Design a protein around this nucleic acid. Structure first.
Ligand SMILES: [K+]
Ligand SMILES: [K+]
Ligand SMILES: [Mg+2]
Ligand SMILES: [Mg+2]
Length: 222
RNA sequence: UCAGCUCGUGUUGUGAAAUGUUGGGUUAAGUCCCGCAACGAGCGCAACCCUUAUCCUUUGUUGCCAGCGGUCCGGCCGGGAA
């Protein structure tokens, strides 16, 4: 709803100087040298994206949430876990999708290390070796924790800030994976299949998007 | 004995190529961490080997002599295993 979005601060945009001219249709206007996104445009476009996401969920298609920004990192994890969907909330590895075959090997290493930790193999290691393994496991977990159970290419991508996650979008476009993304005034919307014009900086705005997308997929799954 | 030299897949470039391997620190070291369109891997680095420095255990002659006994004063002898 528009009332919730204005409360969330979805309408707030970046400063006019950093705008991308392709975003002009979505922008309502500028106040205090800050672009204001037209919520009237956002609400129908958000609804259309949610409807498609619901359909993909009904088909049992895997959904990947990307939110590398630290502010939204935890929220992206929680929303994906809530809907039992895969996520990436730390730096996106270039070639995660395009070079999935190579990236899979790291996933296999992560799960092996996890089992070894549970096994107590680390105890057999001479402390230092265990520490190295532990450090490796932590790094692998942060990067590949969300996609460890994905076991293939995601059927759809939901992205926060298209500009920040340009690599991920470019990979998705290459592999013909549909992209759903929140595009702020500064960002370019050409890559995204389904564009949602909203603030991506604000956690409150981010949570609103994530809550809705998690809910719609969950209904699709049911 | 210098810390270099490369590859697969991905990505960028019409292309030769590039990236990875650069960057911020750090190291004897492409050593390590962090960052990062790269993600991984191999040969090198290091370690694994030999010798040297300390200690313990076992063994005690052809090596040893602290404590005993005796001396031809030489562990020399009976001994002892320190
Ligand atoms: K050129
Ligand atoms: K290459
Ligand atoms: Mg090395
Ligand atoms: Mg060596």
């Amino acid at each position: 709803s528009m009332r919730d979005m204005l409360k969330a601060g979805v309408h707030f945009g970046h400063q006019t100087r950093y705008w991308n001219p392709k975003m002009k249709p979505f922008i309502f206007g500028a106040r205090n040298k800050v672009h204001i996104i037209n919520l009237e445009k956002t609400v129908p476009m958000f609804n259309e994206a949610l409807a498609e996401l619901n359909k993909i969920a009904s088909r049992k298609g895997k959904i990947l949430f990307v939110g590398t920004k630290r502010a939204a990192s935890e929220a992206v994890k929680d929303a994906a876990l809530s809907c039992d969907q895969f996520f990436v909330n730390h730096r996106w590895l270039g070639g995660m999708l395009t070079n999935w075959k190579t990236v899979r090997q790291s996933i296999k290493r992560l799960k092996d290390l996890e089992t070894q930790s549970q096994d107590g193999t680390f105890d057999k290691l001479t402390k230092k070796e265990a520490l190295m393994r532990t450090r490796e496991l932590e790094k692998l977990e942060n990067s590949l924790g969300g996609i460890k159970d994905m076991g293939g290419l995601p059927d759809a991508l939901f992205v926060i800030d298209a500009d920040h996650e340009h690599i991920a979008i470019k990979e998705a476009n290459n592999l013909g994976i549909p992209v759903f993304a929140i595009v702020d005034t500064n960002s370019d919307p050409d890559g995204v299949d389904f564009v949602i014009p909203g603030n991506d900086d604000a956690i409150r705005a981010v949570t609103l998007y994530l809550g809705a997308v998690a809910a719609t997929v969950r209904e699709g799954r049911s």
